[PDB]
Amino acid sequence: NDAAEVALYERLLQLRVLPGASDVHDVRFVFGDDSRCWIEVAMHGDHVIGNSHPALDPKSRATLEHVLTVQGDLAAFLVVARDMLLASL
Amino acid sequence: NENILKLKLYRSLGVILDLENDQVLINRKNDGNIDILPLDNNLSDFYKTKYIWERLGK
User: Fold this and answer.
1) Mutation choice for A interface testing from B27, B49, B51 by most A CBs within 10 A
2) Which label site among A19, B11, B23, B43 has the fewest CB atoms less than 10 Å from its CB?
3) Which CATH class is domain A1-89?
4) Starting at the edge strand that comes first in sequence, how are the strands of the sheet with A52-53 ordered?
């Protein structure tokens, strides 16, 4: 069922989309990994919405941001985000 | 509803999950063409997913 695929989607992607509710549209990417790590950002609009919760140093939020705007390959971003979330452990 | 947005994300990574046979389908953007991976307990299914996903990045 739709819930069954969604379970395999999150269970194996260790990535969940948590929209921020309040008054402005916001997307919070959450990585399911004990330390619980997440970054706030969206491909829609952009505002002071700047929150980062990795588990090592700001360099992650830095290289991760420069990576998406510099590579233009959203694949190298989620792919490097995974390898980066691991290095934090 | 937003289900299409989530599938659009994983689909953007070049992954095409399919429960029509408990298997994950895949597409290699660089060189290669299409690839398939069956779901199995194996030793570390989590590592297998990080394997195709690391290669999909290329």
Assistant:
1) B49
2) B43
3) alpha beta
4) A15-20, A26-31, A37-40, A52-53
Closest CA to B24 of B12, B37, B14: B37
The CATH topology of domain B1-58 is: Double Stranded RNA Binding Domain (3.30.160)
Contact B3 A78 (CB under 8 A): no
Method: NMR
- How far apart, in whole angstroms, are the C-alpha atoms of residue B58 and residue B54? 8
- Which tokens in the block code for residue A55? 């588990």
Q: Which residues of B touch A76 (CB under 8 A)?
A: 57
The domains of chain B are located at 1-58
